[PDB]
Amino acid sequence: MGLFDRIKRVVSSNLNDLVNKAEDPEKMLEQAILEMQEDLVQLRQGVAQAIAAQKRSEKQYNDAQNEINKWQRNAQLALQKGDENLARQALERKKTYTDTSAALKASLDTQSTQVETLKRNLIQLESKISEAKTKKEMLKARITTAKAQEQLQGMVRGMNTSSAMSAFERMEEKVLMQESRAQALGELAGADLETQFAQLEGGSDVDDELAALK
Amino acid sequence: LDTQSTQVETLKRNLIQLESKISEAKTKKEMLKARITTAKAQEQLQGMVRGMNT
Prior knowledge:
- The PDB classes it as lipid binding protein.
- This is part of a larger assembly, with two copies of chain A.
- Helices cover 86% and strands 0% of the residues of chain A.
- Chain A has helices spanning 2-21, 25-79, 84-149, 163-188, 193-200, 204-213.
- The A-B interface holds A 138, 142, 145, 149, 152-155, 168, 171-172, 175, 178-179, 181-182, 185-186, 189-191 and B 4, 7, 11, 14, 17-18, 21-22, 25, 29, 32, 35-36, 39, 42-43, 46-47, 49, 52, 54.
């Protein structure tokens, strides 16, 4: 039911956000590296197994290829007594083992191609994981810069946005009001309005003195 | 390495600017603290207007 669909999507949209809430950028990146490295270990284990299988199948081909001559040796040692049937059967078995050796050598070349194309694979993927870790470190440094950076920025007078910055602005406005009051007391008092203006400005006397001395 | 060079230079500029800001802010802090110290006693000592005690 559409009702059930929409109610389920509604319930997922809260777990999803709690999960996004308990996300920490730096700390989280660690797994993205650990698991990559572990599965890299698995992949290189497989690569090694392929290498080993080829290096093991080389055994039978080596046996058969050295045998392609050991059989001539056996045939010679047999005909040295004057028997030709034994040397002839040695030739037949040598032909059999030579066909086996040829098939195994073709298979060995094929596995050589496979292992080289598997060598290229692993080199590329190791390079990728390594460069990825380099980026991981640089970006983790980025995160560490940003985290504190956003608690510390310019002191724009028209915002607080922070603990040490909201304390500063508050005491600043407190300073301003305090000085305003301090000037207000005299501004509120005064011997006479003309006395207040004379206090503000000396008058023609000071202008004349400035002109004369100057 | 060139990309990280750009990053570290843009991170060098960041820190220089923010250090300048905190330093100038401390300068203002000191001057305003002197202001406060002036005012605190200043308001206990002013003209002797005959029409108030205060």
